[PDB]
Design a protein around this ligand. Sequence first.
Ligand SMILES: CCCC[C@H](CC)COC(=O)c1ccccc1C(=O)O
Ligand SMILES: CCCC[C@H](CC)COC(=O)c1ccccc1C(=O)O
Length: 259
Amino acid sequence: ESADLRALAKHLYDSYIKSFPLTKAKARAILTGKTTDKSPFVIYDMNSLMMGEDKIKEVAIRIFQGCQFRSVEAVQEITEYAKSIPGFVNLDLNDQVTLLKYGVHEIIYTMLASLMNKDGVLISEGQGFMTREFLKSLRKPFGDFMEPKFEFAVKFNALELDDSDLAIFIAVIILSGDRPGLLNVKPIEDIQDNLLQALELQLKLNHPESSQLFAKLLQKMTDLRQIVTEHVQLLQVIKKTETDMSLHPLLQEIYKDLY
Ligand SMILES: CCCC[C@H](CC)COC(=O)c1ccccc1C(=O)O
Ligand SMILES: CCCC[C@H](CC)COC(=O)c1ccccc1C(=O)O
């Protein structure tokens, strides 16, 4: 029954708002807004970076460390959202870990797109905006870790999804039965089948003129995999070149034996 699918869509969107403080709606209002109350301070070079610290050791590493801290925070928010997905907390506890282990980063880059345009990315809960060019200008190990994310974002943002769409799509990503090491795949696939039904109806009702948006959104899950694998390889180079830099334990376990 379609009424049951709309109830699941509403449930996930409600939990989405409650779990993620900075939504796409708020992010787009800051990036495009004529508004005067929520304009961000823009960081585009070293001087503005130093002044931005007042308004809001090596620079490249200090940026990379703050990027980690935000990723850890995003994992915490994604984990809170996953518990709201009907059936997720009832699954085998080991599979819950496995689904989060492989899903968080694919979700992080999906939602990171909400904070991005072709010119840069919002930071500090929308208070700041770091330009895409300043990130490319960083030292050779840290000058390339965001550029692939921007490339995905500009394409993904062309789909013009809103938060109500993303809430369901994010749930579909977590409940993937093809994750390595899943003990009982069937109960996971049964949940995804229902989430996929809810996403399909959501996109046909919210985007009636967007032809095959459902299929085109699912195909984007291939771009996400590429980003993760490329990011993992970049992290291995950094751990060898910078033996004094520390990675967050939560992020270390997520990447432990990923592929
Ligand atoms: C401009 C701010 C972008 C922040 C987002 C996370 C929401 C993307 O950061 C990462 O994915 C990341 C970056 C450096 C080191 C580790 C990671 C990581 O998650 O493992
Ligand atoms: C909730 C929305 C994102 C919030 C966080 C920061 C709390 C995003 O900020 C960053 O990742 C970041 C990147 C480069 C330089 C500084 C930072 C930084 O720690 O501010």
